Design a protein around this ligand. Structure first.
Ligand SMILES: Nc1ncnc2c1ncn2[C@@H]1O[C@H](COP(=O)(O)OP(=O)(O)O)[C@@H](O)[C@H]1O
Length: 157
DNA sequence: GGAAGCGAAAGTGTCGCAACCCGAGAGAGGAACGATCTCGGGTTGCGACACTTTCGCAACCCTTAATACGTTC
RNA sequence: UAGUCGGGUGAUUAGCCAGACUCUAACUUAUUGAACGUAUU
């Protein structure tokens, strides 16, 4: 499947069990690498599940999620591919996440040398709408500091 | 293909809390014996969370290259 | 309207001017090797 995401707003519609949540999940997994390498040099983002994400029928028992990002005329393409092979497969497929690491390295290094505006990556899935608020004191890393905005940003809730 | 570090993802154990049970005990009433509410352990079920295991990113570039100037794979 | 093509001007990778295109839809890449162009030859 291929999609042509719009620059400002894209709406995905369909019946139940058509793959809209799957598309959002794949995009969030792709953005996790950008978030991780912004927070942490050479950081590891999320990866495709080897138990559920690969198509049940399949022909090669592996799945790929290719994404291309635009960052102006100076960087017209940032290709990142997430790949995973199914359980019990001799040949394992690797992911091509280097350009995302390079772009996030640019962001992080420039920001530390001189403060810049950082991009926002958020996922609001069905795990939202959970009851209650402020369940625990949540000793988690000083919400005041700037890089706390990337904590659990693509978790769904 | 995959050091060395490290973190994601998934599975499993554990451990504390709640909920209840059960015997002991001082003693309400009203004229005695012991109702009834509480104290102190003890057991079980459960779920959040810690702990455990596996995978995968991607150093280096091996003895072993050539060195007019440009695109392309 | 975008976006794209690129003829001109421009101390010139920028800015501007004229013109044109639109399958749902480019993202310019890699050497010393191979071939191509060019220069010595
Ligand atoms: N690994 C898989 N192989 C084949 N079909 C799958 C797999 N995982 C999910 N599906 C199917 O694809 C659909 C996934 O649903 P989902 O992506 O949440 O769609 P939506 O948000 O449109 O309801 C369901 O119909 C599910 O049965």
């Amino acid at each position: 499947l291929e999609i042509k995401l719009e620059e400002d707003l894209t709406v995905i519609i369909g019946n139940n069990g058509k793959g809209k949540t799957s598309i959002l999940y794949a995009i969030a997994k792709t953005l996790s690498w950008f978030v991780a390498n912004i927070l942490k040099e050479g950081g590891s983002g999320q990866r495709l599940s080897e138990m559920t994400d690969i198509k049940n029928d399949a022909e090669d028992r592996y799945s790929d999620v290719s994404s291309t990002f635009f960052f102006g005329k100076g960087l017209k393409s940032v290709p990142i591919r997430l790949s995973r092979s199914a359980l019990g497969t001799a040949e394992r497929r690797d992911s091509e996440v280097k350009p995302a690491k390079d772009l996030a390295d640019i962001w992080r290094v420039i920001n530390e040398v001189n403060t810049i505006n950082l991009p926002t990556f958020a996922l609001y899935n069905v795990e939202r709408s959970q009851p209650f608020n402020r369940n625990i004191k949540d000793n988690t890393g000083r919400r005041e500091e700037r890089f706390d905005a990337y904590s659990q940003t693509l978790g769904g809730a």
